[PDB]
Structure formats: structure tokens, C-alpha cells
């Protein structure tokens, strides 16, 4: 909600601010999905 709206790049500041958020915005969904599938699984499986 602050990354992708700013990832609406413009001009010679194109991929600049674009790749900026997205790369990490991609990394947000991948960190969420891991924090919803893997990190849970592993945490349950074996924490203590």
C-alpha cells in the first residue's frame, strides 16, 4: 500500500522506482506465502 503505488514510475525514473518496490513487493508476497505455508509448517513440525 506504499510500495506499489510508488512503483507507478515515470519518465527516466522508470524501472528506477518501479523495480524498486516490485522486487521487494514480490519479496513481500513470497515472504507472506512462506510465513503462511513454510514458516508455519516448519514451526509446527519442529520448534522445540
Amino acid at each position: 500500500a506504499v510500495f506499489v503505488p510508488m512503483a507507478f514510475f515515470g519518465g527516466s525514473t522508470g524501472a528506477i522506482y518501479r523495480q524498486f518496490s516490485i522486487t521487494i513487493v514480490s519479496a513481500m508476497a513470497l515472504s507472506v506465502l512462506v510465513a503462511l505455508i513454510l514458516t508455519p509448517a516448519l514451526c509446527a513440525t519442529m520448534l522445540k
Partner: protein
Amino acid sequence: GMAYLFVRLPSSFLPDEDQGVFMTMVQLPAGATQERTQKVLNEVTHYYLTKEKNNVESVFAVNGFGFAGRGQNTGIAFVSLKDWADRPGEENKVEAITMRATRAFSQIKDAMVFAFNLPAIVELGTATGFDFELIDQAGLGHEKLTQARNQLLAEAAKHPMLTSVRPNGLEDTPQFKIDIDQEKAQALGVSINDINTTLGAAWGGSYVNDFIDRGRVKKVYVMSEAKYRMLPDDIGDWYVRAADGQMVPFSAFSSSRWEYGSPRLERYNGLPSMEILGQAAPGKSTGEAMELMEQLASKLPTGVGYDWSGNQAPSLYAISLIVVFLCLAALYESWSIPFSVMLVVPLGVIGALLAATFRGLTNDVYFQVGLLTTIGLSAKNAILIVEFAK
């Protein structure tokens, strides 16, 4: 504070950094030769070879090829700095290398040589800097347009909160005009065809035909030994055949006289123009200088017009304010949580500013996204302070 820690912090685009590789060009006065400019290229090459061994691995001089264009005036030498491990200090890094280098060329010389960190950036977008251009919209000539540019460059430096403005490269050197009296020619009995390919195929060069050399087809050119085309007195050496099987000197039909032309005529968008590379003031920045230059070009004679972080963010962040509140209500419906998080924004950002205002950083691209990430963690922290406690 936060606000003042931000409005006062200067805005760049992307930081110029050491690349293990820089360069530096040459520019001689009006109508200099290949032997004059070559003397300078030597002095340049050796500041790097004798007074910079620890730093420089290898130079690569070039005589007659600037990044303005070409000619015996111009020049450049490509540097290749020894690797970064053997170059430890800040003095052994291109910021400081092009500092005492440029100092040396403004000290012990009588021409123009610089040096620059290769803009890692792109060619364009220096920030606090512009590229103006001066079009001749009406039917004025190159000579009348020149005068308007001398009045533009004058008026900015006449009252510069300043500016730093200069031309691009129209030195304006003289030219050896040869008038051929047409009546005289045919009376002595010469074709104007033959006369033109005498002066053309001697002094300049002429692509005649192709020949074969060791497999690969190359070209065959025709001209004249250097010594018969160095000065204007050597024009009379060339005798052309006339209809009546007998020679005729150039001087007979020739007229010798000098003139003031220009050795490079720029043309922006179908019309003659002249480039004006000026920078923003040391105080002001672009939008100020640019609009304080449009009012100076509009104060010039008739038939002379013109043509040239980001404004980006203002609107980008606007949608960062809209999407937040909704996402701060897709799992946090109330109008209580959607204003909680709304304060962690400048909680953290004040420090982001502070660390970069303290050290020698600026508001570049990496910092502007160092803000957005600082806000994403600010949200996190706060949303846990909320989600759990609710």
C-alpha cells in the same frame, strides 16, 4: 523538525561512484593542428604515468576525436585505473584523482583539459543542471542567431542565486574562400568541371575506385603530397589544362580572401540552433534556473525562440496515502486502526533523514526507497501493537 530536515536536504538522482575507469578530453583554440594538440596529449598522458603510478594502470591517448565531435582541435585519453585493492585511500579514488588532475590542467597549460567520473547514471539527468537550446524560428541567418546567443549568455552572466552558463562548441574559426570568376575561366578556355575536381581531388580527397589487397577489397584515394597544400600560396602551384592544349595558373581566374564562418552548424528540429549548456545556481535548483532562463530568451530579438527525486513522487506517494488506509481497514475495519499506523510514518522517517543529513549523503534514489522500506517496517511494528491488542 522532520519537515525542515527534508526540505533543506538537497535532491540528487543517483550517486556518482568510482568505476576503476575514467576519462578526460582536450580542446585547442581556433584552427589548431594535429601537431599542436599532440603536444598536449603527451603532457596529459604523463601526469598519469609519472605523477600517478600507484593509481594508473594504463592510459590510451587519441588525437583528433573529442566528445564534442572531431577535428585537429579535439582530443581524449581513456584511463584505466589499477584495481581497487591497490588503490586504498580516498585520494586513491576517482573523486580525488580527477580533482588534482583538473587542477594540473588549469595550471601548467594554455588550452582546455578537464576530467570526470564517468556518469554512472545515464548521460541525462544531472540534477541542478540543464540543456537549453536556441532556435532561429524566422528567416535569420547563422550570423544573426550567433549574436542573440552572445546576448543570452551575456544577460545571464550580467545578472546571475546565480547560474553557470557557456556554449557547447561553435568556436567560429575562419575559412579560405576562393571566388572563381566565371567569365575569366571560359575566356582562357577551361571547363568549370575540370577546375572543381582539381581543387577537390588535390586539397581534400576523392574516392576514385576500389582495388584488391590481400583478399579484402579496399579503396583507392587520390590527393597530393602534404607540402603542396599547406598554405594559401600553394594554390598557384596547380596548373589546369585549357581547351587550347596549354596550361593555366589558378591565380589567373582565382581570387584569394578570408572569411568568418563556423566549423560546426547545429540544427535542432529542421531549423538552425545553438546549444547552451548551463547549470543551476549553487543555491537554486533547475525548476528555478530553467524558468529564470525562459524569461531571458524571451527578451531577445525577433525570430529567435527556444526549446529544452522528480515531480514523480508528489503523486506517487499520494496513492501511497490512499491504498494504505484501505489496506488498514481490509483487516482492521473501524476508523480507529486506520489512524494508528498513520503516525509511525514520521516516527521512523525523522531518523532516516537525520542519518543522511549528518553524513555526506543526499536525497537520491536509494534513500527515497530507504524511506518506503522504513515505512513498511513502521507499519509492521505498529500493526502488531494494534492487531494483538485488539
